[PDB]
Amino acid sequence: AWDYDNNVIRGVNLGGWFVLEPYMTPSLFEPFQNGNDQSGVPVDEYHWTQTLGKEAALRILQKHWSTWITEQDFKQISNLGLNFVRIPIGYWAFQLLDNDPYVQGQVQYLEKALGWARKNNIRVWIDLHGAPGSQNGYDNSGLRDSYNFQNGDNTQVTLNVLNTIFKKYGGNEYSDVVIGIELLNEPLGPVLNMDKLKQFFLDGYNSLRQTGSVTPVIIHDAFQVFGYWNNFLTVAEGQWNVVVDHHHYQVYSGGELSRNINDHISVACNWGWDAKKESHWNVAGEWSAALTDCAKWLNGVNRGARYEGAYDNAPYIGSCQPLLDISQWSDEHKTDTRRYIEAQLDAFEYTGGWVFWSWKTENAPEWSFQTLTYNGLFPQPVTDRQFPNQCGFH
């Protein structure tokens, strides 16, 4: 169904759908605010379902699931020249821990989506985005500020959920649609035991192949240096059909944010230079147009922006309010944005391709493919260039 040699991925993530993210759908969380006091807002899906209780959480989520992304979205993705989507899903869609507050029903909508992708000639990765106890302490794992994926039986539970995914979506039924299963989104390598994480990736590889699946195994880079994975899961050891997923951003520290526009572009070009040198096939599974961390609740519910020196001991660089709404952007910021998107596109097509985070948001424009396209900032067709050859690839 795919050729990671000769084809190029041109995709979007379906984010904020089966795993709630406050900055993407703030309407689901804001109602819990009293005046300007944010302290009573649930910080993640785990606490959001917990406050609501099972029956009310299911009523509200059924409404969200049935409207957030639909068949018409897949038709529009196809019409815009895209060939691919990445679909995040939490472990809790499949299996619950004894005391978990989460509700199920996502699986019905995933299977509808695999049908909508087939109908529109779209390929798919299925991505396990949250594991029990949390692999990273981010709100996008379901459970913020906890790091217990490697504690007790959380790893074994994660493997059991993956085996389910392998059997239902990695076999003959979906082999014309699914061109990857990603074992785990963004395990936080710096805080985890890396020998144990490598054994987990190896167990998932062997257990997928064991069911008779020929589906590519997708491994996230775990925030390690370029080349760190070069001797892991290699053809020289009979390990085949493996892709490394890199996520590329410039907004999550004071130093990256401080860069001028030319420097942001030099960094983007260099991503592509260095990926070309790697031994594994590789794809930029996440990236965006963001030059700030200004979108409301981007770093979490009740946390400010590094860009205005209001998070993570970053110093002040610039003020967020005039950048919240794209109608209010200056000509300079529009131009900077167009340049940055085109440089990234050129860098990512130098190897396996690219998957923009994300298709849509309620009103975070730096993070919405639809909003950027409609405003003339994301190329359409995706090959169009107002600033051709910023990188000079050989």
Swiss-Prot record:
Pfam families: Cellulase (PF00150). Disulfide bonds join 269-391, 294-320. The active site is at residues 186, 286. Induction: Expression is maximal during the early rapid growth phase and increases during biofilm growth. Induced by caspofungin. Transcripts is also regulated by RCK2, SIT4, and HTG4. Its EC number is 2.4.1.-, 3.2.1.58. SUPFAM superfamilies: (Trans)glycosidases. GO terms for molecular function: cell adhesion molecule binding; glucan exo-1,3-beta-glucosidase activity; transferase activity. This is Glucan 1,3-beta-glucosidase. It comes from Candida albicans (strain SC5314 / ATCC MYA-2876) (Yeast).
